[PDB]
Paper text:
The genome of malletwood is the only known plant genome that contains a gene coding for an α‐actinin‐like protein. The results clearly show that this protein has all properties of genuine α‐actinin.
The N‐terminal actin‐binding domain (ABD), with two calponin homology motifs, is very similar to the ABD of any α‐actinin. The C‐terminal calmodulin‐like domain, as well as the intervening rod domain, are also similar to the corresponding regions in other α‐actinins.
Residue numbers in the entry: 37 to 275
The structure:
C-alpha cells in the first residue's frame, strides 16, 4: 500500500520543485542526444506519449537498433511502441518496478520522469567505475577526487555541495585551468559561479545547459537526479 508514493518520495517526484527541476533538466539531456538524430522534444510529458522519440532516444544512446515502430492514430500503436522501449530497457538488466506503457501513453508526469531517470541511470551512470565504487557512488567519488585540491569545495552529495557553483567550476578547471579564473571566484556570488560553469561547459565542452542557476539558487537542497544527470555529461566528456 502506497509503495509507489514511498518510492516517489525518494525519487524526488512528490516535491513540485524537484519535479520541475527534473522536467527541465531531463528535457535538455534528452535533446542533447536526440539532436544527433536531427530531432527534439519540447514538452517531456507530451512528446514521448506515442513512443517514437523514446525509441529513438534509446537507439542514439545505446548505438543499437530497436524493432521497427508502429504508426497510427490509435492508442494501441502508442502502447506497442512504448512497450518496445520498455522491453529494450529491461533487456539491459533493469527492474521496471511499476512502470507501465499505459501511464506513459497517458502522459503521467511522475511515471514519465521516473522512466527517463531509469534511462539516464542505466545508460549514463550505471557503468561508471571509479576505484571500487560504481554507478552513483562512483560518479560522486570521481567528483570528490577531481575537486580534492580546492579548499573552498567540499563535495559530500549531489545537492547542496553544488549550490554555490564552485564545485562545477572546479571540475572544469581541474581538466582545462585555461578556461576558468578559479581564484577570482568566491562564495558570495553563487549565481555568477553557476552561470560561469554552465556557460563555459556549453561553449567549450559541448555540454548543454541542463541546469538553471535560478532554480539552484532558490533551493536549499536542489534535486539530486537533475544534478547527477548534468554531472554525468561532465564525466563522459573527460573520462
Amino acid at each position: 500500500y502506497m509503495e509507489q508514493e514511498e518510492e516517489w518520495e525518494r525519487a524526488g517526484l512528490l516535491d513540485p520543485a524537484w519535479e520541475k527541476q527534473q522536467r527541465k533538466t531531463f528535457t535538455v539531456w534528452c535533446n542533447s542526444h536526440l539532436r544527433k538524430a536531427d530531432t527534439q522534444i519540447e514538452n517531456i510529458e507530451e512528446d514521448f506519449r506515442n513512443g517514437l522519440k523514446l525509441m529513438l532516444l534509446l537507439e542514439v544512446i545505446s548505438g543499437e537498433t530497436l524493432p521497427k515502430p508502429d504508426r497510427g492514430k490509435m492508442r494501441f500503436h502508442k502502447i506497442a511502441n512504448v512497450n518496445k522501449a520498455l522491453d529494450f530497457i529491461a533487456s539491459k538488466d533493469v527492474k521496471l518496478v511499476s512502470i507501465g506503457a499505459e501511464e506513459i501513453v497517458d502522459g503521467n508526469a511522475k511515471m514519465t520522469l521516473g522512466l527517463i531517470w531509469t534511462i539516464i541511470l542505466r545508460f549514463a551512470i550505471q557503468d561508471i567505475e571509479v576505484e571500487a565504487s560504481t554507478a552513483k557512488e562512483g560518479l560522486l567519488l570521481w567528483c570528490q577526487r577531481k575537486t580534492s585540491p580546492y579548499k573552498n569545495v567540499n563535495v559530500h552529495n549531489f545537492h547542496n555541495s553544488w549550490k554555490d557553483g564552485l564545485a562545477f567550476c572546479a571540475l572544469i578547471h581541474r581538466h582545462r585551468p585555461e578556461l576558468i579564473d578559479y581564484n577570482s571566484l568566491t562564495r558570495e556570488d553563487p549565481v555568477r559561479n553557476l552561470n560561469l560553469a554552465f556557460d563555459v561547459a556549453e561553449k567549450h565542452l559541448n555540454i548543454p545547459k541542463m541546469l538553471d542557476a535560478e532554480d539552484i539558487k532558490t533551493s536549499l537542497k536542489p534535486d539530486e537526479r537533475a544534478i547527477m544527470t548534468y554531472i554525468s555529461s561532465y564525466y563522459h566528456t573527460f573520462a
